[PDB]
Amino acid sequence: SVLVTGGAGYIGSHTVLQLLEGGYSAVVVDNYDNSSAASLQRVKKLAGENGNRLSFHQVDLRDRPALEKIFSETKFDAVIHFAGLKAVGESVEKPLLYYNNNIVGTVTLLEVMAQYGCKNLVFSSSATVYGWPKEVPCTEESPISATNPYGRTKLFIEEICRDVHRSDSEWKIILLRYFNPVGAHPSGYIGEDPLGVPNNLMPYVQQVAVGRRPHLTVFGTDYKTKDGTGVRDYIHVMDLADGHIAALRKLDISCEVYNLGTGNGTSVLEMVAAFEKASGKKIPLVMAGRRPGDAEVVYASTEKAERELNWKAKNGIEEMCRDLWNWASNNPYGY
Amino acid sequence: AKSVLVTGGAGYIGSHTVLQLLEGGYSAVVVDNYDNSSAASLQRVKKLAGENGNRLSFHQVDLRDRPALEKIFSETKFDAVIHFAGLKAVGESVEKPLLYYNNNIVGTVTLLEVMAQYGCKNLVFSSSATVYGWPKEVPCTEESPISATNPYGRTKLFIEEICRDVHRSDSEWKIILLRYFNPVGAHPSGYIGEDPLGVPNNLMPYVQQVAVGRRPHLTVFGTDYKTKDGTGVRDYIHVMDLADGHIAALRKLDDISCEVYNLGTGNGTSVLEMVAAFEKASGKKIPLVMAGRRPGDAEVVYASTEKAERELNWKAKNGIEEMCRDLWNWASNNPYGYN
Numbered sequence: 325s326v327l328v329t330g331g332a333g334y335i336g337s338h339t340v341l342q343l344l345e346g347g348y349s350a351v352v353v354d355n356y357d358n359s360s361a362a363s364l365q366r367v368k369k370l371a372g373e374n375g376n377r378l379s380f381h382q383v384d385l386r387d388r389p390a391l392e393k394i395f396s397e398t399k400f401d402a403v404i405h406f407a408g409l410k411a412v413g414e415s416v417e418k419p420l421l422y423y424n425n426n427i428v429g430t431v432t433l434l435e436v437m438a439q440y441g442c443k444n445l446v447f448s449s450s451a452t453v454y455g456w457p458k459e460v461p462c463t464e465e466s467p468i469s470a471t472n473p474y475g476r477t478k479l480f481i482e483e484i485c486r487d488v489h490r491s492d493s494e495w496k497i498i499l500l501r502y503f504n505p506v507g508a509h510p511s512g513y514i515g516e517d518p519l520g521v522p523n524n525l526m527p528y529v530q531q532v533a534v535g536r537r538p539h540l541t542v543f544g545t546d547y548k549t550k551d552g553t554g555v556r557d558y559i560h561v562m563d564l565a566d567g568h569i570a571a572l573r574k575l576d577i578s579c580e581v582y583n584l585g586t587g588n589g590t591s592v593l594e595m596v597a598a599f600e601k602a603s604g605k606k607i608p609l610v611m612a613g614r615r616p617g618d619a620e621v622v623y624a625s626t627e628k629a630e631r632e633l634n635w636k637a638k639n640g641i642e643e644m645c646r647d648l649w650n651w652a653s654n655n656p657y658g659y
Numbered sequence: 660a661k662s663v664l665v666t667g668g669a670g671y672i673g674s675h676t677v678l679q680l681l682e683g684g685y686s687a688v689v690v691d692n693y694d695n696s697s698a699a700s701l702q703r704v705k706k707l708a709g710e711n712g713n714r715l716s717f718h719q720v721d722l723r724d725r726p727a728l729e730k731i732f733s734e735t736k737f738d739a740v741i742h743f744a745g746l747k748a749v750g751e752s753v754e755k756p757l758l759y760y761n762n763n764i765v766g767t768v769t770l771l772e773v774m775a776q777y778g779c780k781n782l783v784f785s786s787s788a789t790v791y792g793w794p795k796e797v798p799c800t801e802e803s804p805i806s807a808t809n810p811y812g813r814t815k816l817f818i819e820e821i822c823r824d825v826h827r828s829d830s831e832w833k834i835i836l837l838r839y840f841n842p843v844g845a846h847p848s849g850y851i852g853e854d855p856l857g858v859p860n861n862l863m864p865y866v867q868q869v870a871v872g873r874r875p876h877l878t879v880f881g882t883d884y885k886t887k888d889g890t891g892v893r894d895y896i897h898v899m900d901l902a903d904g905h906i907a908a909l910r911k912l913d914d915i916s917c918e919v920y921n922l923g924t925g926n927g928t929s930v931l932e933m934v935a936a937f938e939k940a941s942g943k944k945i946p947l948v949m950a951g952r953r954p955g956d957a958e959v960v961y962a963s964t965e966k967a968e969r970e971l972n973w974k975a976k977n978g979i980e981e982m983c984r985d986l987w988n989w990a991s992n993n994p995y996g997y998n
């Protein structure tokens with residue numbers, strides 16, 4: 325039995341499927357800022373027998389009363405905290421919005437959790453907490469520093485979780501530092517459907533592929549990388565979902581960080597070419613300047629996760645691209 | 660013709676600052692939730708301010724109460740905001756970190772948002788030497804590394820970072836970040852001073868309260884630091900010097916974009932030294948319980964003063980003796996604080 329904040333969205337939807345298919349119950353709260361209820365309807369159907377163990381509500385985490393209402397009806401062995409804004413670039417323009425949504429929402433959540441005595445937390449952290457790492461790959465023990473508000477909200481929240489742990493050892497906390505999840509369920513029945521203009525690379529590429537967007541703008545061509553463009557560790561969202569069930573087993577340790585990545589670094593152009601390969605479509609590119617807040621090279625050391633959580637990323641880039649295209653092809657306009 | 664909103668204004672440092680603002684021609688609205696103060700402070704500031712008291716209103720308002728805060732901003736135009744509101748005990752923060760992140764950061768963000776909403780983008784922020792962490796540099800300069808070692812310290816470091824990001828997003832903003840060291844003392848009239856609710860957390864308000872019978876001893880947090888006497892060293896500054904530094908800050912604001920100034924004296928004093936100076940001023944004995952360190956306390960912390968002297972044209976004028984003198988003056992006539 326779990327509470328999934330942000331469960332209508334990209335990673336949480338997929339993860340809810342896995343929870344259901346692992347025999348878990350799940351309550352979702354989401355305010356549909358960057359998702360819709362249609363994603364969870366589908367997940368309900370696709371999970372088949374086990375769909376009646378999913379329930380979901382439109383709730384903002386900053387709305388303490390409505391969130392308290394949730395915690396009063398059901399009890400949770402755990403909370404998976406997906407909810408928040410996630411765009412580096414946006415956050416530089418709109419820092420207050422990021423600090424508002426992410427910190428106020430998280431703090432509200434953590435306080436409600438204490439009040440109703442649920443103190444097991446799995447948190448969506450981000451590789452962004454490594455800033456511009458001087459050394460790669462990025463280990464869980466390497467310096468944490470951020471270079472933009474979004475990264476800061478994740479670093480600060482990690483720091484808040486540490487302090488709560490230190491304050492009270494009833495808490496069991498796992499900080500999952502996701503790198504760059506891409507792809508879709510292999511059925512193509514569910515996948516990434518961001519609302520408003522997209523910010524992440526691959527959902528922007530999928531929209532270019534079906535004509536919903538005219539070009540991908542490439543943020544930077546003068547980086548110290550193989551091809552001048554940014555490098556990241558892209559990991560299939562279905563692998564990431566399975567990393568959550570792993571983290572839940574692990575909880576039964578106090579306050580632990582685990583990277584979730586593949587351990588390979590892929591450039592932007594590489595990912596585009598891998599997408600063109602999987603889709604047969606051509607993605608027009610605009611080479612522009614760097615996006616304020618972006619790191620250069622960032623990829624995971626996956627070894628702590630591999631050994632501690634007994635979890636590996638299985639899918640490679642071609643699998644990520646095939647599943648993504650399969651979703652996009654069969655759902656060009658989303659849910 | 661200059662109007663200021665003062666958060667946490669009923670509190671210790673805000674109280675005294677508000678009075679100087681009134682005395683220096685400013686007008687002022689205070690919002691405060693009375694978590695660590697009472698309205699008596701501000702009643703007495705009205706009296707102490709004379710006719711200038713007539714330019715002060717105060718309202719019971721939590722900064723996290725957005726409707727209430729927006730009300731405040733829609734009823735008055737503000738040329739600037741001095742943000743004092745917050746919880747401030749290092750030790751309390753370690754025990755109760757959510758309370759701290761909540762009150763300090765939800766507080767601050769909500770105000771920042773309302774300020775932007777109403778087009779008032781001139782901020783003076785109450786930061787702290789605790790952003791210097793357990794430092795390797797002494798003296799601690801505005802260019803020296805920052806890093807907290809406890810939740811309270813983090814709220815201040817984080818909020819500074821938030822203000823930097825707001826400045827970066829939006830060049831209309833003018834923010835001065837004041838790193839106060841350890842303010843002590845009271846108005847020389849002795850008619851106002853520090854009065855926390857419940858058990859005091861700061862050194863000298865605890866000491867005052869021991870001196871007048873209200874607490875049985877001072878618990879000295881660590882006698883095994885690597886200092887003259889093994890107790891913590893800090894830069895204690897007269898709250899009135901501190902107050903005046905805010906008039907200086909408010910002036911610099913009409914020049915500068917997001918700018919850090921230390922407010923201290925640049926001398927380091929031990930806990931036992933401050934105890935000794937207070938016994939000398941008050942003529943009362945302070946019983947001492949020698950205990951272990953307080954989670955998250957620095958060893959030695961004291962200020963660089965060069966930047967503030969140069970750029971705010973501000974320097975402490977009062978010494979430890981005055982600090983204890985005015986503290987005792989306040990405490991002797993007001994042993995249980997305000998009524």
Ligand SMILES: NC(=O)c1ccc[n+]([C@@H]2O[C@H](COP(=O)([O-])OP(=O)(O)OC[C@H]3O[C@@H](n4cnc5c(N)ncnc54)[C@H](O)[C@@H]3O)[C@@H](O)[C@H]2O)c1
Nearest residue numbers: 330333334335354355356357358359385407408410448450
């Ligand atoms: N997607 C990535 O590449 C990536 C990488 C690292 C970390 N993360 C983090 O993982 C989490 C999930 O990201 P995602 O890719 O699934 O994005 P997403 O936007 O699809 O998921 C976030 C969900 O949270 C909801 N939400 C936002 N603010 C809310 C609020 N105040 N109350 C309730 N619900 C709210 C949105 O409606 C959305 O469904 C986020 O915290 C993100 O920062 C994502």
Ligand SMILES: NC(=O)c1ccc[n+]([C@@H]2O[C@H](COP(=O)([O-])OP(=O)(O)OC[C@H]3O[C@@H](n4cnc5c(N)ncnc54)[C@H](O)[C@@H]3O)[C@@H](O)[C@H]2O)c1
Nearest residue numbers: 667670671672691692694695696721722744745747785787
């Ligand atoms: N006293 C020190 O040594 C010291 C040192 C460095 C920094 N500071 C900072 O200076 C500021 C003033 O400190 P002080 O010594 O006057 O403390 P104080 O406790 O006397 O003043 C703070 C005031 O804020 C009010 N308040 C708290 N949370 C509030 C909220 N959410 N909404 C409205 N009002 C709220 C309290 O009721 C109190 O009146 C604080 O930000 C503190 O962190 C103090």
Ligand SMILES: O=c1ccn([C@@H]2O[C@H](COP(=O)(O)OP(=O)(O)O)[C@@H](O)[C@H]2O)c(=O)[nH]1
Nearest residue numbers: 412523524525528541542543554555592618
């Ligand atoms: O429209 C876009 C979005 C992303 N990127 C690049 O793709 C990588 C991953 O971007 P995304 O925003 O998905 O992830 P992040 O690493 O910022 O979390 C980075 O090098 C970005 O510069 C890009 O060139 N164009």
Ligand SMILES: O=c1ccn([C@@H]2O[C@H](COP(=O)(O)OP(=O)(O)O)[C@@H](O)[C@H]2O)c(=O)[nH]1
Nearest residue numbers: 749860861862865878879880891892930956
């Ligand atoms: O009851 C107390 C309060 C404070 N201190 C010490 O006095 C100094 C000033 O502490 P305070 O909490 O007043 O200010 P801080 O420097 O923590 O902001 C520090 O070395 C504290 O360890 C102490 O020994 N006992």
